[PDB]
Scaffold this motif. Structure first.
Motif, mmCIF file in Angstrom:
data_model
loop_
_atom_site.group_PDB
_atom_site.id
_atom_site.type_symbol
_atom_site.label_atom_id
_atom_site.label_comp_id
_atom_site.label_asym_id
_atom_site.label_seq_id
_atom_site.Cartn_x
_atom_site.Cartn_y
_atom_site.Cartn_z
ATOM 1 N N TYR A 46 78.565 46.432 76.710
ATOM 2 C CA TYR A 46 77.632 45.342 77.009
ATOM 3 C C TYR A 46 76.444 45.355 76.032
ATOM 4 O O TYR A 46 75.896 46.421 75.744
ATOM 5 N N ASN A 47 76.092 44.168 75.525
ATOM 6 C CA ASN A 47 75.023 43.944 74.534
ATOM 7 C C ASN A 47 74.345 42.596 74.817
ATOM 8 O O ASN A 47 74.646 41.951 75.821
ATOM 9 N N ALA A 48 73.431 42.149 73.950
ATOM 10 C CA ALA A 48 72.680 40.916 74.234
ATOM 11 C C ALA A 48 73.588 39.693 74.408
ATOM 12 O O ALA A 48 73.244 38.746 75.124
ATOM 13 N N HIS A 49 74.750 39.727 73.763
ATOM 14 C CA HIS A 49 75.667 38.589 73.769
ATOM 15 C C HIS A 49 76.795 38.752 74.769
ATOM 16 O O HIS A 49 77.644 37.865 74.923
ATOM 17 N N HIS A 50 76.808 39.895 75.446
ATOM 18 C CA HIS A 50 77.795 40.135 76.488
ATOM 19 C C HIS A 50 77.186 41.031 77.554
ATOM 20 O O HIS A 50 77.311 42.244 77.493
ATOM 21 N N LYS A 51 76.494 40.409 78.504
ATOM 22 C CA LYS A 51 75.781 41.146 79.539
ATOM 23 C C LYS A 51 76.647 41.326 80.786
ATOM 24 O O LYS A 51 77.594 40.552 81.028
ATOM 25 N N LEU A 52 76.320 42.343 81.577
ATOM 26 C CA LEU A 52 76.943 42.526 82.887
ATOM 27 C C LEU A 52 76.146 41.715 83.907
ATOM 28 O O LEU A 52 74.949 41.939 84.055
ATOM 29 N N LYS A 53 76.822 40.789 84.592
ATOM 30 C CA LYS A 53 76.188 39.962 85.613
ATOM 31 C C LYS A 53 76.520 40.597 86.958
ATOM 32 O O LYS A 53 77.691 40.741 87.303
#
Ligand SMILES: CO[C@@H]1O[C@H](CO[C@H]2O[C@H](CS)[C@@H](O)[C@H](O)[C@@H]2O)[C@@H](O)[C@H](O[C@H]2O[C@H](CO)[C@@H](O)[C@H](O)[C@@H]2O)[C@@H]1O
Ligand SMILES: [Zn+2]
Length: 1016
Positions: A46-53
């Motif tokens: 997970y990074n700024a462009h793929h966050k855990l919701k």
């Protein structure tokens, strides 16, 4: 073009029988996740462009009866939970809450003032409070009949549509003890798009988690195309409580249940308490919590994570709402602001979670596996399999099936007319539906409630039965009286119901005798109802005060009848034997009633001074050493006596049954020439362990294979008649009866386990049939699923629910046992079937009930036994996970679950009586049923609406041409049809406006609903 449910084996990613065959089921210590492994994740996932919701979903599990009654819990807990939810959600717009049990919500909402009702509607409309499933209860999935699962779902959802203007499309089932594919079947046909389950075997959770197969498209076992599929989320961990929902380590998760710091009388068993979140600890606390979330997220395929936040009867105290909310708010503010976490966390609802998952799916981020099969038998740890509740409290399990049928018959009989409000028809039917619906709860029909709570459920069901009787008898009187004569008193009993099998002979003396006599009353009208949509003939019996009685139809055509004694069995505490006594003043008369589809037929019983021409008398033979006389008053045939001996009986041109000297079946001969096929009934007993874990209401933990019940030299009674014969024997704890009426025998067991502590009584059938390790059991009375006995699992793991039937077969022969009540059973060796009758357990089994099962009472269990040749039948392939009944077995099941209803006219003379109703109703194909007929409108509606649920089963093709039947169009059953619409099964949404106002029949294994609208 209907899908073929027999010949096409579906291709699925996960097929649960196949999975079971391959899995090792090793119970190893996985570390902090005791039944899993140490989960690892790549921090760079997970990074700024793929966050855990992350959606944290607050909830409160509210049992409609368990350790307290429904009303006790409502007064002591639930009314406070709901009142404080209303206040706290109103005052905190970002807070969320989900609610499952509509019985409680309706109980609360109707007691609110208008100002509060409006505030409630507003927090539902704005999405803060969300209903999940929306059934009256969260039902058991093992013992419940599909018809009653639908009934309770409809009761809750109809209430929600009317009062809250919402219909849930996501289901939440965190608590039933194992899970059935009957649920997605009904839910998907009721508008649902998603469902959630939790209580599955720990080894299954581990296996699916390893493959990220905990979210799946759950289709039916026969569904080749996949149109039945429903997206399902299985929770991964041991419990739905907070310690087992944040992530894999409960020692960590427990620190995030803010009700456990001390003032609430709760603590963490892992010995580290929660701490109030502050600016000085929020970073360390967040690091621990996010690490748990990211571990849980490794088990699933999208970047959207579900975190339930709740437990039993949570969110009561205002202080509890505050302590959970304020601490989570501080965590969210920190976590969401620290980019290094790459997490966005918030309170959410169940639907919000599923919407986000499917958004991820459409974005191409995940594909989900397909699955078929079920999730029985559940084990939560070690060898603790929850197969005990398939049998616990069997009196009430049987009562469920009786009330199921009476609700259907009352709704159907009264649907034919519109009724004035003063008749109280809608009132009585709503009460009956609601009490039956309540009992579907996963502590109701399961037999897992405290004694006083079982009594409450029983009292409620008794009131429901009385309500159904009232509606049924008023309806019969209207349907069969000349219209210009009909003059109803809506409080009066024009007829009483006569039920030969509930509570049963030897259970309650409840049946009325028809009293005839030269100086009182020469004759009596009786009426039979047939709720099934085909013509039926069936033997029916009544008690009468003379043996000299004959029967006519209402054209005064004689009807052949048989008279038999009334025999009752007595545990003679003087002689220490169990033996029958005959009445000298009441007799049984038996005759064939022929009744139209969904119709009524009237007969007359008339006394004479001597033997009538068209009535015959059974012989009776008592087999025992040292007999004493058995006088029978006016009964014209003297009882005969003999020493115990083997005997054979045949009624009509049906099978020939042979019995041992102890009165138990030993063989069946289908036809004049055929072998006497060994089919042997035996009673055995399981005990309880003297070391380790004890059996209780939930768990079956036997101390080895069952041991034979010592029979002694039991007394056997043989009654032989032209229409009906029987063999009855008084065994220890069971009066066992085999009844023959010319086709498959009926078995009745009057089971009284008495004071035998730590005993489970099983009825076993021993045959030659080369079944190996395969057997079939049903799911919710809807479908038959293939089972494989697994010697790598303990005995109790090989027990499954028997909600309506089970069978074994080889290439040539099948034996099917149909039941009138859900019980547990298995096939523990090739050629065997067994089914548990009752269980009496001294100990609690550590699942929260806090008592044994020591409140047993006599129960009359009913069965049909069908031995058949199947070499000519077109069966599924060896790889198909389903099986299917034959015509004869399906009819035998209908004979148990939906018998003819019998009504006795109360008064001396019925003025304006008619002989028949429904003679013009279509007689539909044998595989089709009108499961529900329900008028949906009160009398004030200009446009009347009637709802129908049709179900088509699938019967094996075995070369019987069974010919010409009439098409059933339910939309034309009532006159002046103006519209016909296909609806969801709850009747709450119109799906299709039907051409010509014609409701098409359904495909095999399909269920459809239709509503007809009528202008007059
Ligand atoms: C596994 O045992 C479970 O215990 C809870 C006890 O819940 C109460 O105490 C806990 C622990 S401190 C609190 O956090 C809760 O809010 C409660 O005050 C039982 O209630 C729970 O019952 C559930 O499972 C049983 C089967 O084990 C069902 O029969 C029942 O319907 C319910 O779903 C369980 O005993
Ligand atoms: Zn529960």
């Amino acid at each position: 073009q209907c899908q073929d449910v027999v010949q096409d084996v579906p291709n699925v990613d996960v097929q649960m029988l196949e999975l079971y065959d391959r899995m090792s089921f090793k119970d190893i210590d996985g570390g902090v996740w005791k039944q899993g492994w140490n989960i690892k994740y790549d921090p760079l996932k997970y990074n700024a462009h793929h966050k855990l919701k992350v959606f944290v979903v607050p909830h409160s599990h509210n049992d409609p009866g368990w350790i307290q009654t429904f009303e006790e819990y409502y007064q002591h807990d639930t009314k406070h939970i709901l009142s404080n939810a209303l206040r706290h959600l109103h005052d905190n717009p970002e807070m969320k809450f989900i609610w499952a049990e509509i019985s409680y919500f309706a109980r609360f909402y109707h007691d609110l003032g208008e100002n509060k009702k409006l505030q409630m509607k507003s927090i539902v409309k704005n999405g803060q409070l969300e209903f999940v499933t929306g059934g009256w209860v969260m039902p058991d999935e093992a013992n419940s009949h599909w018809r009653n699962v639908l009934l309770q779902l409809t009761e809750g959802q109809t209430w929600l549509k009317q009062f809250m203007n919402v219909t849930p499309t996501a289901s939440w089932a965190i608590a039933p003890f194992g899970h059935s594919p009957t649920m997605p079947y009904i839910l998907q046909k009721s508008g649902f798009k998603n469902m959630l389950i939790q209580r599955t075997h720990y080894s299954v959770k581990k296996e699916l988690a390893q493959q990220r197969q905990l979210e799946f498209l759950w289709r039916q076992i026969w569904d080749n195309k996949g149109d039945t599929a429903l997206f399902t989320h299985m929770m991964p961990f041991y419990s739905y409580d907070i310690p087992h929902t944040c992530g894999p380590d409960p020692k960590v998760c427990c620190q995030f249940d803010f009700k456990r710091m001390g003032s609430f009388g709760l603590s963490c068993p892992w010995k580290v308490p929660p701490r109030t979140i502050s600016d000085q600890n929020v970073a360390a606390r967040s690091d621990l919590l996010v690490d748990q979330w990211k571990k849980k997220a490794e088990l699933y395929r999208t970047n959207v994570l579900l975190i339930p936040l709740g437990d039993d009867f949570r969110f009561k105290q205002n202080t509890e709402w505050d302590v959970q909310r304020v601490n989570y708010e501080r965590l969210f503010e920190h976590i969401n602001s620290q980019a290094h976490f790459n997490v966005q966390a918030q309170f959410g609802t169940l639907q919000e979670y599923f919407d986000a998952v499917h958004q991820a799916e459409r974005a191409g981020q995940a594909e989900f596996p397909t699955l078929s099969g079920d999730f029985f038998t559940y084990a939560d740890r070690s060898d603790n399999y929850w197969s005990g509740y398939y049998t616990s409290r069997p009196y009430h399990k049987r009562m469920d099936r009786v009330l199921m049928h009476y609700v259907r018959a009352a709704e159907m009989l009264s649907a034919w007319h519109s009724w004035d409000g003063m008749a109280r028809i809608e009132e009585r039917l709503e009460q009956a539906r609601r009490e039956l619906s309540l009992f579907q709860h996963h502590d109701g029909i399961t037999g897992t409630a405290k004694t006083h709570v079982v009594v409450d459920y029983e009292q409620r069901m008794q009131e429901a039965l009385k309500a159904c009787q009232m509606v049924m008898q008023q309806s019969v009187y209207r349907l069969l009286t000349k219209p210009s004569i009909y003059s109803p008193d809506f409080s009066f009993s024009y007829f009483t119901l006569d039920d030969s099998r509930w509570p049963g002979s030897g259970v309650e003396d409840s049946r009325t005798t028809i009293i005839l006599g030269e100086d009182i009353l020469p004759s009596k009208h009786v009426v039979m109802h047939n709720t099934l949509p085909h013509w039926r003939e069936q033997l029916v019996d009544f008690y009468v005060s003379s043996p000299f009685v004959s029967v006519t139809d209402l054209a005064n055509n004689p009807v052949e009848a048989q008279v038999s004694p009334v025999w009752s069995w007595h545990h003679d505490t003087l002689t220490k034997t169990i033996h029958p006594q005959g009445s000298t003043t009441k007799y049984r008369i038996i005759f064939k009633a022929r009744v139209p589809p969904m119709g009524l037929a009237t007969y007359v019983l008339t006394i004479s001074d001597s033997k009538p021409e068209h009535t015959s008398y059974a012989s009776n033979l008592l087999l025992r050493k040292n007999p004493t006389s058995l006088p029978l008053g006016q009964y014209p045939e003297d009882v005969k006596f003999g020493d115990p001996r083997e005997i054979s009986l045949r009624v009509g041109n049906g099978p020939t049954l042979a019995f041992s000297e102890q009165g138990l079946l030993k063989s069946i001969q289908l036809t004049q020439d055929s072998p006497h096929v060994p089919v042997h009934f035996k009673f055995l007993k399981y005990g309880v362990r003297s070391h380790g874990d004890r059996s209780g209401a939930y768990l079956f933990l036997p101390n080895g294979p069952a041991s034979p019940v010592e029979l002694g030299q039991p007394v056997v009674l043989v009654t032989k008649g032209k229409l009906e014969s029987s063999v009855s024997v008084g065994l220890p704890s069971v009066v066992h009866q085999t009844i023959m009426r010319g086709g498959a025998p009926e078995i009745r067991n009057l089971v009284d386990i008495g004071s035998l502590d730590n005993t489970e009584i099983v009825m076993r059938l021993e045959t030659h049939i080369d079944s190996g390790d395969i057997f079939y059991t049903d799911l919710n009375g809807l479908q038959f699923i293939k089972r494989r006995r697994l010697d790598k699992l303990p005995l109790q793991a090989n027990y499954y629910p028997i909600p309506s039937g089970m069978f074994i077969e080889d290439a040539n022969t099948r034996l099917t046992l149909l039941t009138g009540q859900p019980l547990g059973g298995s096939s523990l060796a090739s050629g065997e079937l067994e089914i548990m009758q009752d269980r009496r357990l001294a100990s609690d089994d550590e699942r929260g009930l806090g008592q044994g099962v020591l409140d047993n009472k006599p129960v009359l269990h009913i069965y049909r036994l069908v031995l058949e040749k199947v070499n000519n039948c077109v069966r599924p392939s060896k790889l198909h996970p389903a099986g299917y009944l034959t015509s004869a077995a399906h009819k035998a099941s209908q004979s148990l679950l939906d018998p003819l209803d019998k009504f006795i006219f109360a008064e001396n003379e019925w003025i304006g009586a008619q002989g028949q109703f429904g003679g013009d109703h279509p007689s539909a194909r044998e595989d089709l049923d009108v499961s529900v007929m329900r008028r949906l409108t009160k009398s004030s509606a200009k446009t009347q609406r009637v709802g129908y649920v049709l179900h088509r089963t699938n019967l094996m093709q075995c070369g019987t041409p069974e010919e010409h039947t009439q098409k059933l169009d339910v939309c034309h059953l009532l006159p002046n049809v103006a519209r016909c619409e296909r609806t969801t099964l709850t009747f709450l949404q119109n799906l299709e406006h039907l051409d010509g106002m014609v409701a098409p029949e359904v495909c095999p294994m399909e269920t459809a609903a239709y509503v007809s609208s009528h202008s007059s």
